[PDB]
């Protein structure tokens, strides 16, 4: 992985720096690294593809070194370098694609393609140089077992789930108390509804709780907490829990009461935020507990009092809400997020070449299924393919 990244990095630096007219002093070290790459790869045969519709491709390396003396680079130098770089970039892209489409339940972090397994030999370690990218840096740190940290803008940590819980219900679905939520991506909208508006609730307060267990521990997380959940604040015909029938929801939004957002690690309260909205920081957590209360207004204007009668029918249903958006976070594991394209790249490569479903990932690399059952083998394979995809993105 480090040798493949070094190949890609050398090729990227050659493309960016070996340009007509530039001083040779701008590239001398780069030229030496490029020549080391050529020497190390010379006389080696590689094969890629042979899986799905990915074509079999053979690669033989017989290239000369760059040894010309110049003060400034000219067109001849750049054309020679360009020919060599084009061949090497094609080889690296094919190796990356071959590795991205493969997986194993055992040793999923280890190389899977024969080309990358061959690149893991000692004789190729000479190619290795600067490893500065976040993904390769995390790879090296993990191989050393230090903390690795991936920073995510809007991490895709919550599998999609639009669900509800009815704590009080009956077949007519006209006197319901419960919660409905959408946990999607970095976002959580939750709403506790009571059709009676806590008319008979002790102290005229109805308590709602929502526990969301993250599949991985998040750290240094910036969270936006807003009082209302816009997704559960309009009239809605919802299906029955078993699908037999449909019930009606006619929200009237009351501000949530006694809001407590707890960020827990191993069941222990790491962060607690009471009646606090806007930007908050969760420094280290694996679970979120949103506890909020529907409090019946002690004093109502006639228009308000008309909405909440003493008994059924309950035409307007009192709803309190909460919206929790993870703007940014850090995770030791790899995740999809709004800013990066690694999941997109892997999925595109697997779809384009019609890669059959393997024993590790779900069909089509569906992120919801993958994150729902984010097993250690899945995590290893995902980190491998994401690192390969980041390596490929440097060139392609």
């Amino acid at each position: 992985m480090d040798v493949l990244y070094s190949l890609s990095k050398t090729l990227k630096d050659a493309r960016d720096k070996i340009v007509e007219g530039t001083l040779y002093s701008n590239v001398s070290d780069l030229i030496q690294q490029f020549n080391q790459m050529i020497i190390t790869m010379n006389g080696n045969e590689f094969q890629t593809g042979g899986i799905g519709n990915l074509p079999i491709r053979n690669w033989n390396f017989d290239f000369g070194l760059l040894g010309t003396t110049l003060l400034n680079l000219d067109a001849n130098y750049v054309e020679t370098a360009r020919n060599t770089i084009d061949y090497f970039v094609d080889f690296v892209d094919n190796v990356c694609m071959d590795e991205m489409v493969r997986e194993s339940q055992r040793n999923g972090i280890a190389p899977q393609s024969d080309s990358l397994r061959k690149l893991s030999g000692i004789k190729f370690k000479r190619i290795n140089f600067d490893n500065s990218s976040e993904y390769i840096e995390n790879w090296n740190l993990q191989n050393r077992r230090q903390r690795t940290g991936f920073t995510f803008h809007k991490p895709n940590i919550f599998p999609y789930s639009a669900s509800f819980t009815l704590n009080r219900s009956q077949p007519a679905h006209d006197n319901l108390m419960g919660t409905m939520w959408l946990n999607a991506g970095s976002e959580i909208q939750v709403a506790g509804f009571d059709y009676s508006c806590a008319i008979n609730a002790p102290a005229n307060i109805q308590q709602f709780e929502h526990i969301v267990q993250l599949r991985r521990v998040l750290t240094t997380a910036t969270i936006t907490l807003l009082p209302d959940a816009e997704r559960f604040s309009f009239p809605r015909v919802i299906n029955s829990a078993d699908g037999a029938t449909t019930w009606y929801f006619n929200p009237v939004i009351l501000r949530p009461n006694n809001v407590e957002v707890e960020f827990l690690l191993n069941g222990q309260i790491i962060n607690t935020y009471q009646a606090r909205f806007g930007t908050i920081i969760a420094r280290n957590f694996d679970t979120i507990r949103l506890s909020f209360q529907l409090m019946r207004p002690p004093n109502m204007t006639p228009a308000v009092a008309a909405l909440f009668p003493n008994a059924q029918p309950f035409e307007h249903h009192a709803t309190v809400g909460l919206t929790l958006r993870i703007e940014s976070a850090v995770c030791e594991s790899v995740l999809a997020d709004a800013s990066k394209t690694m999941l997109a790249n892997v999925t595109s490569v697997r779809q384009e070449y019609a890669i059959p479903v393997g024993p590790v990932f779900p069909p089509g690399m569906n992120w919801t299924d993958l994150i729902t059952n984010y097993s250690p083998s899945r995590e290893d394979n995902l980190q491998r393919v994401f690192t390969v995809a980041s390596i490929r993105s440097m060139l392609v």
Partner: protein, 246 residues
């Protein structure tokens, strides 16, 4: 050494010459292009007036390729020679420039050499067969240095009388060769058709080689003598001699 490349570990019997490996392993266009030419500048075969002739690349004939050589070695004069001691490097580069700065003289020399070769080759009558000979002519590279560093601009072409003499000697040798082949074949065929089974064709072949005037017959290997006998036996007899024999 100029390009800082690891010294070639060349293996005898390799189908590629050292320059053929260097052409692939050297990236500089001037040196690589000169190496390509040197690798592919073998003789071309062409029949003119029924005579097979070994002819040169047209870039040799007009002397233009010397420019490429110049270009290549000019590049060698600009190279760092990374690890070489600097006084030795300076000496090598100044020698490279000694040859480089005679570009016009070397173009003239190449054109003169090619023209003289073509003019004297017009006077050849027997096929110019290319075979690697047992013994060689030893060419000192110091004589090559003398020719490269001392040639002026005085054109010297073969004299018309020299060309006529060369052509006459070639024609005489060719005609004598053919006539002695005819005599040997006639006598061998007559001896066979006269059923002279005790006749030794070895004596006939030795007389033939002696009349060719350029063979010391005592040093002809026996296998070659018998092969010569076999090949002479296969040739048909010339019409005049065969009619006389009939």
């Amino acid at each position: 050494p100029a390009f800082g490349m690891q010294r070639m570990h060349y293996r005898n019997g390799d189908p590629q010459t050292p320059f053929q490996i260097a052409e692939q392993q050297i990236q500089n266009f001037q040196v690589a292009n000169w190496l390509h030419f040197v690798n592919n500048n073998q003789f071309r075969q062409v029949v003119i007036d029924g005579v097979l002739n070994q002819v040169l690349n047209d870039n040799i004939r007009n002397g233009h390729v010397v420019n490429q050589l110049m270009e290549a070695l000019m590049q060698l004069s600009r190279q760092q020679f990374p690890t070489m001691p600097v006084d030795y490097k300076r000496s090598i580069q100044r020698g490279i420039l000694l040859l480089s700065n005679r570009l016009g003289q070397l173009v003239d020399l190449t054109r003169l050499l090619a023209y003289n070769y073509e003019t004297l080759m017009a006077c050849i009558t027997m096929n110019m067969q290319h075979v690697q000979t047992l013994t060689t002519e030893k060419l000192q590279l110091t004589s090559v240095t003398s020719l490269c560093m001392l040639i002026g601009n005085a054109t010297v072409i073969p004299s018309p009388q020299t060309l006529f003499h060369y052509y006459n000697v070639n024609v005489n040798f060719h005609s004598n060769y053919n006539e002695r082949i005819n005599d040997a074949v006639a006598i061998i065929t007559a001896a066979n058709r006269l059923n002279l089974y005790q006749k030794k064709m070895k004596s006939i072949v030795e007389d033939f080689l002696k009349r060719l005037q350029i063979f010391d017959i005592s040093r002809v290997p026996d296998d070659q003598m018998y092969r010569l006998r076999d090949r002479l036996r296969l040739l048909p007899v010339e019409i005049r001699r065969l009619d006389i024999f009939n």
